[PDB]
Structures are given as structure tokens and as C-alpha cells.
């Protein structure tokens, strides 16, 4: 565990993280994909061997000794708000199980279902709150990665709010 488990937010490419493992915002088929998933494919392509896994689940594949946790959030274009919300919560619960099993002291994590899978909605609060529900009982340092300057400010405020 980390000595004083924390949350932090950084605005940069998650492929350049300084943590002990990475969460991929994966597709169910283990394809290179776009956005975070394509950056992850360019950096850790070996981790896409047998990475396909259903919506609402996470599957870890090692690139050398570096763990890539493939977490599949729902595409809100296809799911109802209700079912999508349930699957998005479940994907983060499976990330917390994997982070714990791996015994890492730190993890780099993107906000699942906030990009191409958002069904054109702002899901910062929805996705971040499910991230906190899952990760709060873990003792890894969590570093959230984002690309937008206004999202960085809002994620930083949400972290500081809880103190
Ligand atoms: Cl960058
Ligand atoms: Cl997405
Ligand atoms: Cl972002």
C-alpha cells in the first residue's frame, strides 16, 4: 500500500504515466481503438494479447512486468442511461479488484465512458463518482489522467472537496 493513499489529477497522455500500472479505457474486442485505447496500444502493444473482455469487466495483461488493466465501460450510444450507469459502476469495481490483486502502490486511471462512449453527454461527475466508490477502499495512490483544461480544474476541485 501507499504510506498515505491519495488521489491526484494530471492533464497529459496516460501513456507517459509515473505509476506502477495503467488502466486502459478498452473496447470489448481487444482492438487498438481510438483515443486513450490507441495511445495504450502504441505504448504497450504486447498487452493486447487475449485482452478481449465483456462490458462492465476488467482484464489484466502484462507488458513485460508492467500491468495493463483493460477496463471496458459501456458505450452510452447503445445502453439505456440506467443499464449504462450499472455497467460503468461495475467496470470500476473490477478495476479495484485487479489493482488490489496486483499489490501495486499506484495506478494511472482515465475517466471511463467520457469520450467516444459518452453518447455525446458530459459524464465527468458520473464517471468520477463511480471511480471514487470503487477505489476509496483501496490503498493505492490513484492518479487520474485527462486532456481538457476545464476537466482538470473540475476533477481537482472534486478531489479537494473531500479534503
Ligand atoms: Cl502529453
Ligand atoms: Cl470513452
Ligand atoms: Cl478530458
Curated annotation (Swiss-Prot):
Interacts with mRNA-capping enzyme nsP1. Interacts (via C-terminus) with host G3BP1; this interaction inhibits the formation of host stress granules on viral mRNAs and the nsp3-G3BP1 complexes bind viral RNAs and probably orchestrate the assembly of viral replication complexes. Interacts (via C-terminus) with host G3BP2; this interaction inhibits the formation of host stress granules on viral mRNAs and the nsp3-G3BP2 complexes bind viral RNAs and probably orchestrate the assembly of viral replication complexes. Interacts (via C-terminus) with host NAP1L1. Changing residue 27 to A: Partial loss of mono-ADP-ribosylhydrolase activity; complete loss of ADP-ribose 1'' phosphate phosphatase activity. In the N-terminus, the macro domain displays a mono-ADP-ribosylhydrolase activity. The central part called, the alphavirus unique domain (AUD) has a zinc-binding function. The C-terminus region, also called hypervariable domain (HVD), is mainly disordered and binds several host proteins. This intrinsically disordered domain contains 2 SH3 domain-binding sites and 2 FGDF motifs necessary and sufficient for the formation of nsP3/G3BP complexes. Phosphorylated by host on serines and threonines. It is a peripheral membrane protein. This is Non-structural protein 3. It is found in: Host cytoplasmic vesicle membrane. ADP-D-ribose binds at residues 13, 27, 35, 115-117. Residues 4-163 form the Macro domain. The chain holds residues 1334 to 1493 of 2474 of the full protein. Changing residue 36 to E/F: Almost complete loss of mono-ADP-ribosylhydrolase activity. Seems to be essential for minus-strand RNAs and subgenomic 26S mRNAs synthesis. Displays mono-ADP-ribosylhydrolase activity. ADP-ribosylation is a post-translational modification that controls various processes of the host cell and the virus probably needs to revert it for optimal viral replication. Binds proteins of G3BP family and sequesters them into the viral RNA replication complexes thereby inhibiting the formation of host stress granules on viral mRNAs.
